[PDB]
Amino acid sequence: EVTLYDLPTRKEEWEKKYLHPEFLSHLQNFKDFDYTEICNDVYSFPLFTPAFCKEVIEVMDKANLWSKPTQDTQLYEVGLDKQWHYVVFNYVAPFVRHLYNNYKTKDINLAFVVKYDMERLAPHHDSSTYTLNIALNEYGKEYTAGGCEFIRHKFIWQGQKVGYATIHAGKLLAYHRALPITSGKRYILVSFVN
Amino acid sequence: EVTLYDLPTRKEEWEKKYLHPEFLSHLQNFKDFDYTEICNDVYSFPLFTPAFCKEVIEVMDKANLWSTQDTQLYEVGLDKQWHYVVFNYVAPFVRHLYNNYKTKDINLAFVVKYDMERQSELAPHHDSSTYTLNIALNEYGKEYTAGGCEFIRHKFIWQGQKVGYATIHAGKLLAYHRALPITSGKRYILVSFVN
Ligand SMILES: [Fe+2]
Ligand SMILES: [Fe+2]
């Protein structure tokens, strides 16, 4: 049975179990891929399956390597940096070339899972060319409130579906802040890409 | 008597001669600064005087270090004057335009010369910068015709920029652009890639 770590050694089984079928079937034709521009130059799109999000959370909860600041754990702390590098350069980068006029992805700065809970958010620019934000658990069923305010766009984005990703410019044009949750737990996967 | 190189040794005289009066008079109050958003998140604004642009072209034409046909500012001893300009004058305006974004460092600063025998391969591209400054150094229609810039993502053609006016836009991701060919004369621009 394929696991999160079997990429790209078991690439075919990995894509079927972990990549969202709408994203996987549009790898070579993103023009008919159903993504949404939630505000100017900011896009929401299905990327990962619920099984991916569930197992990522399980790895992070089991490791208990959270920072003692925003509660997070780096992907490389659980041995998933090489798998994520493959995801970015082979799956995310072609979609970035489609969304942002053939922009070529250079390198990965950071990749981590953030856990918002009750026991544990200023406006800022990201240290990235573009930032990925994947919702790992379900709004309403597992947490309330939360989301992200794009300050410049005057647009608040909340209630992202499980496995859907939000992509936005890191610097200059996408000033933003995370908004707190009011109950439950909210897990997200964040990556800063140059 | 003050020259381009006398910054910041003769700062007051340098600002009066080389900084556009509209920009110089709004250094501490940018909300009333008459700049134009020509397309989404792309702004055109006056920055330099005709004397600045005239003297920069003279320095580049006399140096004849052209090798796009461009010359870097450090090749004529103007890089540190430009470093002062970006951090003391441009950086506060960038914070006003782009939600308090702090300027980190200057990647490149150079003057480009377009002419009939050297129009360059006007290919679409992103810039290796967070934001890019593009200052028009000579007069549209008088010293060259056509030319300009096309913002491909914005679907906006930008032509006929006035002398000493700057265009600022994102370098990566969100401002895919290309220069437009000239039909006569010579077109000089001052470009800086800033992180
Ligand atoms: Fe952020
Ligand atoms: Fe450019």
Side-chain angles (χ1 to χ4, degrees), chain B residues 41-159:
Chain B
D41 302 311
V42 176
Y43 306 89
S44 172
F45 58 99
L47 180 51
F48 296 117
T49 62
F52 174 90
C53 308
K54 173 182 184 173
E55 290 178 15
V56 163
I57 295 181
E58 287 171 353
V59 170
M60 291 310 187
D61 277 339
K62 288 172 186 175
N64 200 29
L65 306 168
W66 301 109
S67 268
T68 53
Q69 182 177 39
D70 50 22
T71 300
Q72 311 296 312
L73 291 196
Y74 77 88
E75 289 181 84
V76 294
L78 281 171
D79 49 301
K80 255 206 288 296
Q81 291 80 357
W82 182 251
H83 184 278
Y84 195 92
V85 165
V86 170
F87 277 92
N88 290 86
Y89 308 127
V90 178
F93 189 40
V94 171
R95 301 197 293 271
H96 166 82
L97 290 178
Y98 295 118
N99 302 100
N100 199 33
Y101 183 83
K102 301 284 179 53
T103 287
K104 274 84 193 186
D105 63 270
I106 301 170
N107 179 25
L108 292 175
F110 52 99
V111 168
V112 180
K113 177 174 98 169
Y114 303 99
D115 50 59
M116 284 293 99
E117 292 323 86
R118 195 70 99 85
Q119 300 242 30
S120 79
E121 169 68 15
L122 311 154
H125 64 280
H126 306 263
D127 291 331
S128 177
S129 69
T130 300
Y131 65 91
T132 298
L133 298 169
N134 188 324
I135 292 93
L137 295 177
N138 63 336
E139 192 171 351
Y140 167 83
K142 175 162 177 285
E143 290 172 66
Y144 73 95
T145 52
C149 172
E150 168 181 12
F151 294 93
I152 304 176
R153 184 179 187 85
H154 302 75
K155 303 179 185 303
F156 180 74
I157 298 277
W158 179 232
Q159 295 184 108

Side-chain angles (χ1 to χ4, degrees), chain A residues 37 40-41 43 96 98-104 125 129-130 151-152 168-175, chain B residues 37 40-41 43 94 97-102 126-127 130-131 152-153 169-176 195:
Chain A
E37 189 171 9
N40 279 348
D41 298 313
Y43 304 94
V96 170
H98 172 86
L99 290 179
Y100 298 110
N101 304 97
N102 203 35
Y103 178 78
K104 170 177 177 299
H125 308 258
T129 303
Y130 63 90
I151 318 295
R152 184 180 187 86
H168 71 257
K171 309 165 188 171
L172 210 73
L173 297 178
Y175 203 51
Chain B
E37 187 176 4
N40 283 349
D41 302 311
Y43 306 89
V94 171
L97 290 178
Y98 295 118
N99 302 100
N100 199 33
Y101 183 83
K102 301 284 179 53
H126 306 263
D127 291 331
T130 300
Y131 65 91
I152 304 176
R153 184 179 187 85
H169 59 80
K172 308 169 188 173
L173 208 73
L174 295 181
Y176 205 53
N195 298 309

Side-chain angles (χ1 to χ4, degrees), chain A residues 112 122 124-127 131 133 148 168 170 174 176-178 190 192:
Chain A
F112 47 90
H124 58 282
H125 308 258
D126 286 334
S127 178
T131 300
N133 187 331
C148 176
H168 71 257
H176 61 279
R177 57 159 177 157
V190 173
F192 296 152

Side-chain angles (χ1 to χ4, degrees), chain A residues 11-26:
Chain A
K11 176 169 172 289
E12 175 166 34
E13 296 166 274
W14 199 98
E15 298 175 340
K16 298 189 181 183
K17 186 189 177 187
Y18 295 131
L19 287 189
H20 193 281
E22 276 312 285
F23 183 85
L24 180 55
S25 61
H26 288 96

Side-chain angles (χ1 to χ4, degrees), chain A residues 133-151:
Chain A
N133 187 331
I134 293 94
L136 296 176
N137 70 333
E138 192 152 10
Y139 167 83
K141 299 192 186 159
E142 290 175 69
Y143 70 91
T144 59
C148 176
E149 173 186 34
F150 293 92
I151 318 295

